[PDB]
Amino acid sequence: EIVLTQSPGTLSLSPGERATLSCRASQSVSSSYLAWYQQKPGQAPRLLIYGASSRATGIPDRFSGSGSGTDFTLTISRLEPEDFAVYFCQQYGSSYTFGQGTKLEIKRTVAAPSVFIFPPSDEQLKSGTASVVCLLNNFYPREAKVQWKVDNALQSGNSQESVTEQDSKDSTYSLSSTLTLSKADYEKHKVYACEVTHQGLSSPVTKSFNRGE
Amino acid sequence: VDENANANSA
Amino acid sequence: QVQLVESGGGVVQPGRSLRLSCAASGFTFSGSGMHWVRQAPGKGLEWVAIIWYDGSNKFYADSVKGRFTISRDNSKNTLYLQMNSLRGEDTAVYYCARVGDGDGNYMDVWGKGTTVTVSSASTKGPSVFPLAPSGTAALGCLVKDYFPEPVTVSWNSGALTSGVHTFPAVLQSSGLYSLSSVVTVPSSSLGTQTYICNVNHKPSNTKVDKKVEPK
Secondary structure: OOOEEEEOOEEEEOOOOOEEEEEEEOOOOHHHOEEEEEEOOOOOOEEEEEOOOEEOOOOOOOEEEEEEOOEEEEEEOOOOHHHOOEEEEEEOOOOOEEOOOEEEEEOOOOEOOEEEEEOOOHHHHOOOEEEEEEEEEEEEOOOOEEEEEEOOEEOOOOEEEEEOOOOOOOOOEEEEEEEEEEHHHHOOOOEEEEEEEOOOOOOOEEEEEEOOO | OOOOOOOOOO | OOEEEEEOOOEEOOOOOEEEEEEEEOOOHHHOOEEEEEEOOOOOEEEEEEEOOOOOOEEEOOOOOOOEEEEEEHHHOEEEEEEOOOOHHHOEEEEEEEEOOOOOOOEEEEOOOEEEEEOOOOOEOOEEEEEOOOOEEEEEEEEEEEEOOOOEEEEHHHOEOOOEEEOOOEEOOOOOEEEEEEEEEEHHHOOOOOOEEEEEEHHHOEEEEEEOOOO
């Protein structure tokens, strides 16, 4: 199959700047059958470019496509706020295959997270499970590390996390992490902590509580 | 036959 | 206005079958080839199948060949995808797309999509637990152990949205989902203002209003 490799994985720019997105095919694309699509969160993809360089109806002229053979480029000449989205390339000459996408995000100043920790509620504990939740609020860039500790034992593999989409107004991210223990294990330990590492923090920040206090 | 040939009526 | 609208998505047990439909309007449906494409949660796009304008030729991705059948009814402006012997890895949003008029079968109009979840989990409403407030304070609700997606969350019936973050759910090893929703508020408002998270899980007809207060 024709594998399309997009680069970079993430592009961080600001409105007004020029974006260059690349797509490389493992085999030469037939008939320049190379298309580019835009996808915003919660939305279906939208065609931007086909035939490597032909703009779709309604697409503004700041979008342009070039390239041939194995190497293709999508250029956005002067970014607008609505252009920050995920972009996919696709070849339609030998079967139908897609790149893995490039995310074009807004670059803004570094912002450290505000960190909060929440113990399990008494209502939940009656059911046999304990969820401990850590919130990292309004931070940038997206890269952040959450390390759960239970009586200073570093936890690995017993938590799950998710991250919001970049905020349309302040361009930050927020993150939620849930540590799951049995009620019996929860009641065997005292100090529950989440330690957060992020570019905006000169050293890691820990928030903690003591069970039943 | 060819999965990438023209699938439209014209 | 050219538009495509998919339907028929739902929960299916592994091994069972489902049929999707796509309704077309605003163009001459019988003149266009049509595609199905799908997107699994957190992943990229994967082409599924194509069908010629008149229903003659059909072609399939290797991942679905022998299990899926694409068909159309030009008299009803409708496209179908019959999915048999479904597996967990078929879970995805399924999009229909029109074949464009330039050279080749690129996708020039897309529908909004319909969601298929392949799972043996049973329908279950969420438990809603408080994330109680410990300047700026944070508080929230943990919406735990529900199936299938989605849930919706608002605060104070929609009147509180500044500073709310409702996070993408995660799928636990139990096969049930869990989600948190939080809000940041002034510390000084905690003794005086009421904060209620409104949770709706339509698949189970479960609606919860939960007041969150300092413990």
